Each structure stands twice: as C-alpha cells, then as structure tokens.
Curated annotation (Swiss-Prot):
Tissue: Detected in heart muscle (at protein level).
Residues binding ATP: N34, D76, N89, F121
Taxonomic lineage from the root: Eukaryota, Metazoa, Chordata, Craniata, Vertebrata
GO biological process: ERAD pathway; protein folding
Organism: Canis lupus familiaris
Keyword Nucleotide-binding (UniProt): yes
Recorded family membership: Belongs to the heat shock protein 90 family.
Residue(s) carrying N6-(2-hydroxyisobutyryl)lysine: K95
Entire-sequence positions represented here: 74 to 337 of 804
Protein name: Endoplasmin
Chief localization: endoplasmic reticulum
UniProt superkingdom: Eukaryota
Mod. after translation: Phosphorylated by CK2. N-glycosylated cotranslationally at Asn-139 by STT3A-containing OST-A complex: this glycosylation is constitutive. In normal conditions, the OST-A complex together with CCDC134 prevent glycosylation at facultative sites during protein folding, thereby preventing hyperglycosylation.
Length: 217
C-alpha cells in the first residue's frame, strides 16, 4: 500500500519547489482553486444525477488552522476521490503533456504554468513536510493518502465516512512556514485568492470569544 511517485512527478515536484520558494503563498491559491474544481465536477454530475449530492448537500470550501498541532486543513465537499483515483491522480501517473510541461517550466515566472496545467497540488510541499489527503467519493469508502514526497501510501480511513463526500488536504507545516498558522494571515490570503471563486469559502475564525465559520468571499 506504499507507492513510489512516478519519475516526472518527482521532477515536477523539484521544479515547482525551486521555482516558487520565493512565493510560497501560491500553495493556498492552488488549493482553493483545486477545491473549486472538485465542487464544479460534482455540481456538473448533479445535473444528471442528484443522488450525487446525497452524502453531503452543501458546496463549500472550509479552511481550518490548528496552530497547536502545526496543521492547516483545506476541506471541500466536491466530488472527492476513490482509492484508485488517489493512487493514479496523485502520483503513479502523469497527465498527457507532463513529460515536459517540464521544458516550459525551466524555459524559455512559473506561477501560471502550474495553475494552467492543473498541477498546483504539488506546491503544497513548498510549505509542508507532510501532506495528507482524506477523501470520500460516492463510489468508494473514505481513504487516506499520505506523503512526505519520498513516497506515498493509501489506506482505508479507520474512522469511516466522516467527510460525507469530499476532500481534506492537511498540511503538516515546515518551520519556515509557521506564519501560515496565523489567522489574520490565512484570512487575508483566502480573501485575496477566493474573490473569483463561485463557491462560498469559510475560514474557522474567532470573534467572551467564540469560534465559527467566517465567510471570506
Ligand atoms: C478530484 O479532486 C479532488 O478531490 C481535489 C480536491 O478536492 C482538492 C484539492 O486541493 C486537490 Cl489537489 C484535489 C485533487 C487534484 C487532482 N485531481 C485529479 C488530479 N489532480 C491533480 C493532478 C496533477 C497531475 C495529475 Cl495526473 O493529477
């Protein structure tokens, strides 16, 4: 249940890190944008079958900081991923045109190259020592994908179905990336990266203080 990344994905990872170490916050743009895509897919699926929305009726992105645990969570109620999809889409295969989307990277700002080829997930390793993807798809049981980028593993989630339908990306942050645990930093970055997203985006925030979802767009 442990897997080597494919070679071009290794190169893509290294390329994305060396390109973007200057602009780490880009990871958040990409995760938000990828969450939006997932929501789009399940909304499209719901056109012809709205049993599609049964496990979870809402279409949202919900972002949560755990400063004490050094975690950042990005959760969408999109289409989710099957176990098989986690293995194929997140490492073992590359999309057509990968086998050098990589020239264009080097040659001829890679900020939009990544967003354009839909490969921004890997910018998560800019700010994170570990990335965990917990995902629930209508056609499968909830699974966990985990990676420090030197391999990955996929397991059935022992907790069962807690997402309903969708995906959480959990980042174990690097020391270099500790500012991304701060609420005002994340809020200000989610506001900026979500103004053109059509799904509502929440940050778990504080306001006798109480916590709750704060809408960011
Ligand atoms: C179906 O996508 C997702 O459930 C999802 C999500 O909800 C939030 C996210 O931040 C990300 Cl990264 C994802 C997955 C992104 C993705 N889905 C299929 C492929 N990929 C990324 C990818 C890059 C190269 C190849 Cl092959 O696949």
């Amino acid at each position: 249940e442990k897997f080597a990344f494919q070679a071009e994905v290794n190169r893509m990872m290294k390329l994305i890190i060396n390109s973007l170490y200057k602009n780490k916050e880009i990871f958040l743009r990409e995760l938000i944008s990828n969450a939006s895509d997932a929501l789009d897919k399940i909304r499209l699926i719901s056109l012809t079958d709205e049993n599609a929305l049964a496990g979870n009726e809402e279409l949202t992105v919900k972002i949560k900081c755990d400063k004490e645990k050094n975690l950042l969570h990005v959760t969408d109620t999109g289409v989710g991923m099957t176990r098989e999809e986690l293995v194929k889409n997140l490492g073992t295969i590359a999309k057509s045109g990968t086998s050098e989307f990589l020239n264009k990277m080097t040659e001829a700002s890679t900020s939009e190259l990544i967003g354009q080829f839909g490969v921004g997930f890997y910018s998560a390793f800019l700010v994170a020592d570990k990335v965990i993807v917990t995902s629930k798809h209508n056609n499968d049981t909830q699974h966990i994908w985990e990676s420090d980028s030197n391999e990955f593993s996929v397991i059935a989630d022992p907790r069962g179905n807690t997402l309903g339908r969708g995906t959480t990306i959990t980042l174990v942050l690097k020391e270099e990336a500790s500012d991304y645990l701060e609420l005002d930093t994340i809020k200000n970055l989610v506001k900026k990266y979500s103004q053109f997203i059509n799904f509502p985006i929440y940050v778990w925030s504080s306001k006798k203080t109480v916590w709750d979802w704060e809408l960011m767009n």
